[PDB]
């Protein structure tokens, strides 16, 4: 799994430990070992949500499996919770795109996971 | 809906009003209220199109529905037009990836848009 | 085809001509003319891979067709090789997401690549 967050929140507002907390919580939530987990945080972005430039975030979670109705609702509660607590972004100004990747379509270490 | 534009055009060349124009024109084009529309503009990028570093853009549009043959061609005319007028990027140096998202695969406000089951 | 690389490697560590090299190599690999290849490299990113901030990369390759089991394995060897040689990123700290795009879902030049039906 890999999680990307793009936000207009300033870099200085991203707390020490944020990437590590995302890694650990995503490990817990997806059931995948933490050595698999990639996280990517992009602050200081030029963004608007609903026409407003108040804090917001556009995110993606890719995973090989473990993507679906109830699972994605659980991920959203977890991830919105973290974005609200750590970056002070309101959950209703967050979008998260979920992608169920086929193993043949994820490259790693000179090959793929197929 | 969310629209992202990544471009090698400098930040200083992005005109006042650009994010708001994108928001408004996308609301009109998709027939969805502007309150739902997210836009993201990323200037000053290291990118090439056809091996040339002349102005170009790589974009994404995500929507739950309202994605398809004729609709996507209309979005391209709209969005290429705006990128040409506002950022002076040639339409033949723009790619836009269109994504028809399933409601169960879009998170928002602690949940997703799949509330039925 | 479009190839995006996001990495925590410094901008200064990206060789001049890297974009051109990626363009040429991708043209050859995909069999598409270079005029249609787009490349995008994003350095200095705040990233972790397996909980570590050692050099890593998260990438995307989009193509209309020419995506598949054997082909993707070939692309991974090629692209991991270039990232290792040019950016000094270990192949086991690279992810590449492959996307087989439908022609109707790729916009270009005021339209899309679905030109056959109305
Ligand atoms: C548009 C959208 C935003 C982010 C990712 N994919 C699509 C969007 C947002 C909210 C909606 C709510 C109800 C119905 N449709 C919606 C969209 O299409
Ligand atoms: C490659 C591409 C570019 C942007 C998004 N997805 C894929 C591409 C570009 C143009 C083409 C024209 C004809 C046939 N195939 C094409 C591609 O694969
Ligand atoms: C994490 C991942 C990263 C990028 C795209 N999709 C998923 C990941 C990595 C390796 C795996 C191997 C087997 C099964 N699942 C995996 C993941 O989810």
Condensed summary:
Three copies of one chain form a homotrimer. By secondary structure, the first copy, chain A, is an alpha/beta fold.
Describe the protein in words.
The structure is a homotrimer. By secondary structure, chain A is an alpha/beta fold. Chain A has a single domain (1-114), classed as Macrophage Migration Inhibitory Factor (2-Layer Sandwich), CATH 3.30.429.10. Helix content of chain A is 28%, strand content 30%. Chain A contains two helices and seven strands. Chain A has helices spanning 18-30, 69-87; strands at 2-7, 38-42, 46-49, 57-63, 94-100, 106-108, 111-112. In chain A, the strands form two sheets. Chain A has a four-stranded mixed beta sheet with strand order 2-1-4-5, covered by helices on one side. In chain A, α1 runs antiparallel to α2. The radius of gyration of chain A is 14 Å and the shape is globular. Chain B binds chain C through residues 6, 45-51, 53, 56, 58-59, 67-70, 72-73, 75-77, 79-81, 91-92, 94-100, and chain C through 2, 4, 11, 14, 19-20, 23-24, 34-43, 62, 99, 101, 104-112, 114, 117-118. β6 of chain A pairs antiparallel with β5 (94-100) of chain C, so a sheet runs across the interface. The complex binds 7-(pyridin-3-ylmethyl)quinolin-8-ol (0IN) (3 copies). One 7-(pyridin-3-ylmethyl)quinolin-8-ol (0IN) is lined by residues 1-2, 32, 36, 62-64, 101, 106, 113 of chain B.
């Amino acid at each position: 799994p890999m999680f990307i967050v793009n936000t207009n929140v300033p870099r200085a507002s991203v707390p020490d430990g944020f990437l590590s907390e995302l890694t650990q919580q995503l490990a817990q939530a997806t059931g995948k070992p933490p050595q698999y987990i990639a996280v990517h945080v992009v602050p200081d972005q030029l963004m608007a949500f609903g026409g407003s430039s108040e804090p917001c975030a556009l995110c993606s979670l890719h995973s090989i499996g473990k993507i679906g109705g109830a699972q994605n609702r659980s991920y959203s509660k977890l991830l919105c919770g973290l974005l609200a607590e750590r970056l002070r972004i309101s959950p209703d100004r967050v979008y998260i795109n979920y992608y169920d990747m086929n193993a043949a379509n994820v490259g790693w270490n000179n090959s793929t996971f197929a």
